[PDB]
Design a protein around this ligand. Structure first.
Ligand SMILES: [Zn+2]
Ligand SMILES: [Zn+2]
Ligand SMILES: [Zn+2]
Ligand SMILES: [Zn+2]
Ligand SMILES: [Zn+2]
Ligand SMILES: [Zn+2]
Lengths: 636, 92, 70, 90, 636, 72, 90, 92
């Protein structure tokens, strides 16, 4: 015989198929040759020549399955307190059997059911519609196993889960298989594959979980402090996570944990905020480590405690930055903040998992701390911060290592970001730097250049524009003084002369000379030589001397010993009037120097204070008629 | 190159693919792998020509003559029994 | 006489020669000292004072005016 | 490694597993609950053999970059070939 | 009898005192009354009327002590392999006895020895001197216990210590007591209290320690990889720390550990830095955690591996910042660095104990990464960074939460510091910001103001001087437009008019058109009204109108439907030229507009492109004779 | 005609009527032509003829005292 | 809390520890190898008693902010007091 | 106020500081603290005046009359026998 359609006896072949499927559902041994023969018979009946009896086969299979499932329901109802395990066994048998008939009835589904099955669109916009035999089996199982016994099975599952929560572990295998069965029964439904599971089990389970964990939270709160209660909370969270991963479907996991966070933690947000006021003050290294994760789970837990940390650091930094000694305030002020900042940084990353908000909350207070105007001086913080630079930039005798300066400078930058009016710092730094270079007080240009580059990287080229030209100005100036000397060689000053050319756009020396100084003849020749020279190599320019800042060394031979002391330009002009006359009146000095009374007297006062001259008038106050005599008996 | 060969002994038939440079020994190893018969008992007959226990290309089995739709033809005999092949069923 | 060091500012004559606001020497002569502020802009102290008595903003960059140095 | 198929007339055809896996119906019979032997009462020797060459042609030329040649179908056996294909889900 | 000095028999009282001290040294029971009587006897002997017998007493005590100590030496020499325990026991016995006689001879020590003891200065700069009985006893013990048996006792102590290193624990009590005794014997010496201990024991012990540890290093290196060997090194270090605290005097602790670090770790620096090349690439979360501490102990270990981390992050950041899509490059480029920076920060702080150098070394590479000019465009990195600000500051339909932007903006600041030419960013930021405000594209000024304040805090007021004026300019400008309208009420424009009074300094609109545009009459009334009004409240001020940027809406009534389209001021006059004549020649437009041909053609091209007009010349190129006709059939 | 918006820069007449090199009004001809405005990336405006002559003497901005670069 | 001292004539004087701790020799005798009773066969009752009052005066007026009054010393007993002080190293 | 007092019984003498407001029973539980004898047996005699178990200030013991350089005078007796106190040794 061949595959041609023919008239086949429905009854005999149907009985053979019934015997075969009855063996299959019980997973009994079946002959492979009998397997193939059943396939052949199924195909023959599907294409039965008088009429395709595939609908009749479907009806007969549905009826037999209904009888079998009703018998299974009776058997389940017979068992008491054993319902879960033996139902799990029946499901395990029946799922495999259903797959076996799905393979058995593949021809019926493909050729008959599929060609007649209602589309999903019709059902969505809409006799039981035809479904595949596997879908039929699962649907009728859910109808006749899950629906009739649903209350009992849910109750038993909840009881077992609660027993596990009490430490009494039931069989994970049976309950997990039953849950997976609940997932499995509607797996053929394309839309909402977890709808039935959520409807019949997940919602009541979540409700009971919330109730039980609310009671547990009440019990633990009544029996423990904040720290013990929160540790128990963490333990319960991890234990319920393990429980869910053991039993429940994965999709519900995040739900259940959320529920355990809600009824059992968020219901007492006020309790969490009540004891954190002191937990951070005590600096409990391990408590905030677990206190952080709990507030992250709840929506509003973190922000309130975040601010409380800001209040603590605000006061903590203030105490470390309030009792500064008025003598060594700058160097210690930088160190005081640095350790306060350095300690909390390691605290946040380690204890608080390196939360970005806490790092942000840290700078919210440190900026308020560094920029605070604690001393009576108004906004002295950038000023005192500035003076720290000189301590690390001034060439001191046996000065500490420049490399050991470098890392200190890097640590200094951290405080630099916290300053409010960073521009004001620049102005203070510039003039303070101006003194350091004009006298060579800086140990090296390179050390200063590191600050220049770092500041430019810190606040752009424009913020360091004056400083960069400032640093550059003297670096080239060394060659200019040398190159000027070559001009004398190329072409007699009589004195040792040095000069710095200053770029007027950057040097903070806006004090224009109000009084017209009279350059001494001994200095006038050098002035003439340089000004003529400057135009030679640098034309189209204008020069302007600030004599009062010019410095020079003066050697007198009138004393018993040659004494050399550094003096200013105004100081030299006054003393040069004594190289011809041992006594000079005030008016003669005024005529010779053309100085104003205020500064000339101040200049004269310095000489009298050092006893370079002797005031010939009995009054301690100097007038226009004051006469001054040289100090022929001065000794040092 | 891949060559498709159907080996036939009586009603028994085995379909396989091998290399054109493969010899009788490889397909014999296939015979011990499935049917477990010693190679000396195995005897190959390409039509009536006994094949030397010689590559398939040397025997005349090429890609053109051995295709998935037109597999090459050869008969298997076992201990020396004469080659016996039962003809296929006749289509209507 | 033993030694001397000299410091002198450098600027181009052509770029600045007169008070920008008033065509007159900036040395106490308006149509009057050299007023100074953080803008580093110098005009007759007479004109600067009357501007400040009128408007409390820099004439050039237009910000609040505070004196720098003198 | 292989599977043996017996036709209506008892002929034995031994093929690789993936050849059987190509047909869904043969997948079902091999999934039935030791040589894996499968009989075909309604299929004679020649039809099953040409179906085996159909499996070979399919597995060779599916996902094959070379041009797929036409597979010959004899008109005197076309009806049996197509009914067997409908039987074997292919 | 009283305390008066008298002639006392030296022999009998001396014998009684000898019996008493003999009982004392053996810690035998002594009557308290006998103790007091011996005190009186000592006092009488010291003040013996014929001659102080204190010198005779001191000699007798020294002789008896010498005999006792020699007997003790004999007893110790009798013991073999028991020397340590029984010598230790004798040590406590003799030390307690020595303290007892020290209390016993208090009067003798004060009156005779102390009054005649050589001063420390005399000993330093200048018969055995006089020593305290406790000092005498300890010195002679060192002379006759420690010195004669020193080699044996050191050898036994080293053997026991090695046995403990081998896991065979000897008695802590005995050997620890002997070790402490080594300090104890010279504890009376004011100068160098640990000299003898270091000389006789600490140096040989350290020598053996280094040799043993160098051998231990060799064995472990030959038997383990880098990770296993370093873990064993850490174990050995902690074990030796425990050992030293258990046995040795505390002062030597830091020494021994140092030795254990020198011979066992640094001896193969080439090896420590050999395998670190891949340990960081693999990102072994735990290996570098213990690999960091080992290099901290050695002087030069850290810097080499520090740089290797910089190389790794340099490449790691580059890969995450090289394959950026040309479409969404700006938003993702900022994001790509963030996790690259964010992950390593948590890595450095947690794994590497939050070392400051590594955090510094991190920024050394990220700055080199962000500022890198990967695209073909030169230095496009700051520019593309600017576009990210627009993405977070452009009001989009259903725009995402501004509060969430604030978090993004804070994260944005982190990469901002890494830019080198931050000024260039400002210039590009301004023009991009110029578009957003002039069209209201920003969500709100408050959102923009956050950027302004943050930038000023980031780089000072000066760097944000223009931008702050930018932001303020329009904020006041809202009232000016409103207040201008009140003037019309106070005193007919006919059109809806809005105006922004831009400030010349901050606004980057340097281009003032040379083309003297002719304001349309419909606009000529309004400009007259405002200019007169502006001088009313804001006299002394010059106004300059950039018409090309002014925006206007024109309603065309000639078409079949009322259409509203927005076009520029240059586009105002063109359509106005068609409200009287449906066709206008090029010269008429040029005469009316009075503006340059180049932009006029561009202006005309735009209108033709949107089919506003119809070009009446067949040439696609517009010439000076090109006539144009209105588009009466235009539709939208 | 339906609606119009106006934008106009604001500056004081007396404060900015001069160029550093010649002091002739920037909107007027330079002294030599008596001629477009040349802009530096330093936001300083000078006559194109004046700046070109200054660049020949030295490549710097006169007010900035820093290297000149043509913004526009 | 108290210690008893017996003079040469057998008189018993009981004072607290801290009173006796002032004298160095007493510290030694109490440090010697239950009532802590010490006899002073070279010191009679009155001398030891006045030594007790000296201890009380010292412990009262050491580190005392109030002005320290003079302690009476009888000339007929001054030599015995001073030699007893040397014996007690106080 | 602190008052320094010496108590005597034959050759036994005890020195102690107390409060001026402290009663005789204070000086008595001093006696049980030192030598464990019941208070009823203990009786205190300021000179020849028996003192009722009455503050020291009421008894006449003040800071002026009880000093570290001059402690006050009082005798002790037990059960009730006559007061017997042996005078101190006579200095030369
Ligand atoms: Zn002026
Ligand atoms: Zn004036
Ligand atoms: Zn200005
Ligand atoms: Zn010019
Ligand atoms: Zn010109
Ligand atoms: Zn400039």
């Amino acid at each position: 015989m061949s595959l041609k359609p023919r008239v086949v006896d429905f009854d005999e072949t149907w009985n053979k198929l019934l015997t075969t499927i009855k063996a299959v559902v019980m997973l009994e041994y079946v002959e492979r040759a009998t397997w193939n023969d059943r396939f052949s018979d199924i195909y023959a009946l599907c294409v039965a020549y008088p009429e395709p009896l595939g609908e009749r086969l479907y009806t007969e299979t549905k009826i037999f399955l209904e009888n079998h499932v009703r018998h299974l329901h009776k058997r389940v109802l017979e068992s008491e307190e054993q319902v879960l395990v033996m139902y799990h066994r029946y499901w395990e048998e029946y799922s495999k059997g259903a797959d076996y008939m799905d393979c058995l009835y593949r021809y019926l589904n493909t050729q008959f059911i599929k060609k007649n099955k209602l589309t999903e669109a019709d059902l969505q916009y809409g006799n039981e519609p035809l479904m595949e035999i596997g879908e039929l089996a699962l649907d009728m199982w859910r109808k006749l196993m899950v629906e009739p016994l649903q209350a009992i099975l849910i109750r038993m599952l909840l009881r077992e889960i609660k027993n596990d929560r009490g430490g009494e572990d039931p069989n994970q295998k049976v309950i997990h298989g039953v849950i997976n069965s609940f997932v499995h029964v509607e797996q053929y439904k394309k839309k909402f594959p977890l709808k039935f599971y959520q409807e019949i089990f997940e919602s009541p389970f979540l409700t009971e979980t919330g109730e039980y964990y609310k009671q547990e939270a009440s019990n633990l709160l009544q029996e423990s402090n904040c720290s013990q209660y929160m540790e128990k909370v963490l333990g319960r969270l991890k234990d319920e996570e393990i429980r869910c991963r053991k039993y429940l479907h994965p999709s519900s996991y995040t739900k259940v944990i959320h529920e355990c966070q809600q009824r059992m933690v968020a219901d007492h947000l006020q309790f969490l905020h009540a004891e954190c006021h002191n937990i951070i003050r005590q600096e409990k290294k391990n408590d905030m480590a677990n206190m952080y994760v709990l507030l992250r789970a709840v929506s509003t837990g973190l922000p309130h405690m975040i601010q409380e940390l800001q209040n603590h650091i605000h006061d903590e930094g203030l105490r470390a930055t309030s009792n500064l000694t008025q003598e060594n305030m700058p160097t210690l002020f930088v160190e005081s903040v640095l350790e306060v900042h350095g300690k909390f940084v390691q605290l946040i990353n380690t204890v608080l998992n390196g939360d970005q908000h806490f790092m942000s909350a840290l700078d919210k207070a440190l900026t308020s701390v560094v920029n605070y105007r604690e001393p009576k001086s108004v906004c002295k913080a950038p000023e005192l911060l500035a003076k720290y630079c000189d301590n690390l930039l001034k060439k001191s005798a046996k000065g500490m290592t420049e490399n050991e300066v470098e890392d200190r400078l890097t640590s200094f930058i951290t405080v630099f970001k916290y300053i409010d009016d960073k521009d004001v710092f620049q102005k203070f730094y510039a003039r303070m730097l101006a003194k350091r270079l004009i006298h060579g007080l800086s140990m090296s240009m390179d050390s200063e250049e590191a600050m220049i580059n770092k500041l430019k990287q810190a606040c752009g080229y424009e913020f360091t524009s004056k400083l960069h030209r400032m640093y550059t100005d003297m670096s080239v100036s060394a060659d200019l003084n040398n190159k000027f000397n070559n001009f004398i060689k190329n072409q007699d000053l009589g004195i040792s002369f040095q000069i710095y050319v200053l770029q007027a756009g950057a040097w903070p020396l806006t004090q224009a000379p109000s009084s017209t100084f009279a350059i001494p003849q001994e200095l006038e020749k050098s002035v003439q030589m340089f000004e003529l020279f400057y135009s030679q190599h640098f034309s189209g320019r204008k020069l302007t001397w600030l004599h009062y800042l010019c410095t020079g060394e003066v050697k007198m031979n009138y004393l018993g010993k040659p004494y050399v002391a550094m003096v200013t330009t105004y100081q030299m002009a006054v003393l040069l009037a004594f190289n011809n006359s041992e006594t000079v009146s005030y008016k003669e000095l005024q005529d010779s120097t053309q100085m104003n009374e205020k500064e000339l007297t101040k200049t004269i006062k310095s000489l009298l204070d050092v006893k370079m001259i002797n005031h010939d008038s009995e009054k301690e106050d100097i007038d226009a008629e004051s006469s001054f005599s040289l100090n022929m008996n001065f000794s040092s | 190159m891949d060559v498709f060969l159907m080996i036939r002994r009586h009603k028994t038939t085995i379909f396989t693919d091998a290399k054109e440079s493969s010899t009788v020994f490889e397909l014999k190893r296939i015979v011990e792998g499935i049917l477990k018969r010693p190679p000396d008992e195995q005897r190959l007959y390409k039509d009536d020509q006994l094949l030397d226990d010689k590559t398939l290309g040397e025997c005349g089995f090429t890609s053109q003559t051995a295709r998935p739709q037109a597999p090459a033809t050869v008969g298997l005999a076992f201990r020396f029994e004469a080659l016996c092949i039962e003809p296929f069923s006749s289509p209507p | 006489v033993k030694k001397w060091n000299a410091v002198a500012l450098w600027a181009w004559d052509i770029v600045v020669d007169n008070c920008a606001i008033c065509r007159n020497h900036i040395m106490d002569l308006c149509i009057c000292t050299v007023a100074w502020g953080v803008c580093n802009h110098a005009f007759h102290f007479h004109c600067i004072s009357r501007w400040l008595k009128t408007r409390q903003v820099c004439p050039l960059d237009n910000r609040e005016w505070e004196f720098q140095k003198y | 490694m292989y599977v043996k198929l017996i036709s209506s007339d008892g002929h034995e055809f031994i093929v690789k597993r993936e050849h059987a896996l190509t047909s869904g119906t043969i997948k079902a019979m091999l999934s039935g609950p030791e040589t894996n032997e499968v009989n075909f009462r309604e299929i004679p020797s020649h039809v099953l053999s040409k179906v085996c060459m159909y499996f070979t042609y399919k597995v060779r030329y599916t996902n094959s970059s070379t041009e797929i040649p036409e597979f010959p179908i004899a008109p005197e056996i076309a009806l049996e070939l197509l009914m067997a294909a409908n039987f074997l889900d292919c």
